[PDB]
Write a protein that binds this ligand. Structure first.
Ligand SMILES: O=C(O)[C@@H]1CS[C@H]2CS[C@H](CS)N21
Ligand SMILES: O=C(O)[C@@H]1CS[C@H]2CS[C@H](CS)N21
Ligand SMILES: [Zn+2]
Ligand SMILES: [Zn+2]
Ligand SMILES: [Zn+2]
Ligand SMILES: [Zn+2]
Lengths: 266, 266
């Protein structure tokens, strides 16, 4: 007698779960997540924005870092997402319960967020998290303005259908810094060709490489910092080795072409 | 450096996950779940009803047992629930994707089901499962009829706000058998007194004991069979030692009174 298997929790590298203090990126923009997951806090005179929250169990750490920055729960106005996987949108439901924040996302991300990442096109129910509702649906190229910082959505479907880059202009040393928070361009274990759940997967990825290459991009940040060669633990040198958006897109495309060739061979 | 803890999966006793073949309860009614979780299949000339599905990973086993019974995915018309915890509603989302089934539930169970059991009044996010939407909302005492079997909802709030007993009349040996599928009356680790998330918890449980005592009840079944002294592995004697609804309610109330006294002492 063999019982059905136990449910398996979504476990990750310890660095993904390693708390860090807030690391300033530009005058209004801070990394407040963990060593290996991005969660960006943007502070304005008219409230704060969070872009991604990381894993589900990061909610309280995020709230601590906001507090350290001067941002109370009522000051958090808006949550934006790169994509609605558990390691980026994980604590969103809880953050909505514990703060004033409302979520803006595109339709694809909203429907995946609302089912807590279940029935994923590639992962099935293997990587789920508490579901949350979007409060605003955004379209490609739409802007959201908070405390006068202007965030623009750039859709870059592929990693998930709803993958989005967010761009905004901050400052440092009195000069503008065009920040591009580009989503993942990876396809981990995905069936790329002839996938019945995502028939135009390859065309979407190619289009997304071109989108990312062309972003306004003085500084690139990514949901997994290593993807853009950030090292959040490296202090004053954390961003020193960061890729350009062009280099990030080129590397992702070369990796993707390799994966396609391997899929054909396997 | 101490990272945040990994997520912990909801793991259960192996007997809860031990597949069994269909066990007939009455002419139209079969247990098709596992040794220690109830999932009742009711077959009519106008489609089938499932009452509970057990754990999330039981979906395929349920579908196998339906097939063994003559019930194809398109023949499954209706899913009813005792309560929307992971060990009873776990596979509902997947069953909806893979069958014709629609879900009927009361409002409390629908909202908990739709958030996949997250933000539970007592468990928090400790016991979550894939979310699903209800297709029909039922009121207390409302009837649903399928292929001419009449199911009546009897609300028995306490274990969850949306806890429901379902009753119907089947036959055996040409005589009616009034079957009562009563929900859990347990309060595992619950704060009973002065609970800010459930202020009238104790009054609801007392009312629910009285509801259960009074059900039409030739045969009692419960979501955890041991609660009503069923032994699904005992073959022709599986139901021999089953409690009456009266005895089940009395035992739950005595246990509940003990728990209250212990809570006061602790
Ligand atoms: O390769 C990836 O993109 C990462 C690293 S591990 C893999 C599965 S979980 C996470 C979803 S973004 N993913
Ligand atoms: O005591 C109970 O009612 C059972 C047994 S174990 C405990 C927590 S999980 C499940 C929810 S019904 N519950
Ligand atoms: Zn992802
Ligand atoms: Zn990720
Ligand atoms: Zn329960
Ligand atoms: Zn249970």
């Amino acid at each position: 007698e063999v019982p059905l298997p136990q449910l398996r929790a979504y476990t990750v590298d310890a660095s993904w779960l390693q708390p860090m203090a807030p690391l300033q990126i530009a005058d209004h923009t801070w990394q407040i997540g963990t060593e290996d997951l991005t969660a960006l806090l943007v502070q304005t005179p008219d409230g704060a924005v969070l872009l991604d929250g990381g894993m589900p169990q990061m909610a309280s750490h995020l709230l601590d870092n906001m507090k350290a920055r001067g941002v109370t729960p009522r000051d958090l106005r808006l949550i934006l997402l790169s994509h609605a996987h558990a390691d980026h949108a994980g604590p969103v439901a809880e953050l909505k319960r514990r703060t004033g924040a409302k979520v803006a996302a595109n339709a694809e991300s909203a429907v995946l967020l609302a089912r807590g990442g279940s029935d994923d096109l590639h992962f099935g129910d293997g990587i789920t998290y508490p579901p949350a509702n979007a409060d605003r649906i955004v379209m490609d190229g739409e802007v959201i303005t908070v405390g006068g910082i202007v965030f623009t959505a750039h859709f870059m479907a592929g990693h998930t259908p709803g993958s989005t880059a967010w761009t905004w202009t901050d400052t440092r040393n009195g000069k503008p810094v065009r920040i591009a928070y580009a989503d993942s361009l990876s396809a981990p274990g995905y069936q790329l060709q002839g996938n019945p759940r995502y028939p135009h997967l390859i065309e979407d990825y190619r289009r997304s490489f071109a989108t990312v290459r062309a972003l306004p991009c003085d500084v690139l940040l990514t949901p997994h910092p290593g993807a853009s060669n950030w090292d959040y633990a490296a202090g004053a040198r954390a961003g020193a080795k960061a890729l350009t958006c062009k280099a990030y897109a080129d590397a992702a495309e070369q990796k993707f072409d390799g994966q396609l060739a391997k899929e054909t061979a396997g």
